[PDB]
Amino acid sequence: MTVAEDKTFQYIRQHHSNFSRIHVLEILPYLSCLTTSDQDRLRATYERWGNQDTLLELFTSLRCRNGWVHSLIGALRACELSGLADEVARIYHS
């Protein structure tokens, strides 16, 4: 990852409680950096382990993927979390 991506990832880890509001199933179809195999894996993960544990798995999966920060920003806006999107963007460019 880039300096920007790492910095963004740490912001996310540090604001666990804000990001925990994300509904995994709702956000997945918007995350274009995930492959369809990635999405299948993550849905099956949700079914078994529920939203919170899957969120953790979702973020560590994301940062293994090219351009995940922008993928996440777009998805957050689509999931009525445009405020989180704006903070993620600001950190990434900070």
Residue numbers in the entry: 1 to 94
From the reporting publication:
It consists of an N-terminal CARD domain, a proline-rich region (PRR) preceding a poorly structured middle segment, and a monotopic transmembrane (TM) domain at the very C-terminus. The N-terminal CARD domain of MAVS is necessary and sufficient for forming active MAVS aggregates.
At the inter-strand interface, the positive and negative charges are alternately distributed at two opposite ends of each CARD subunit, indicating that the inter-strand interaction is mainly electrostatic. The positively charged residues R37 in the 3rd helix (H3), R64 and R65 in the loop between the 4th and 5th helices (H4 and H5) from the CARD in a lower layer (purple in Figure 2B) are in close proximity to the negatively charged residues D23 in the loop between the 1st and 2nd helices (H1b and H2) and E26 in the 2nd helix (H2) of another CARD molecule (cyan in Figure 2B) in the upper layer. E26, R64 and R65 are highly conserved among MAVS molecules from different species, but D23 and R37 are less so. We performed random mutagenesis and screened for soluble CARD mutants by using a recently developed solubility screen. Biochemical analysis confirmed that most mutants from the screen were expressed as soluble proteins, and eluted as homogenous monomers in gel-filtration chromatography. They can be mapped to the two interfaces identified in the cryoEM model.
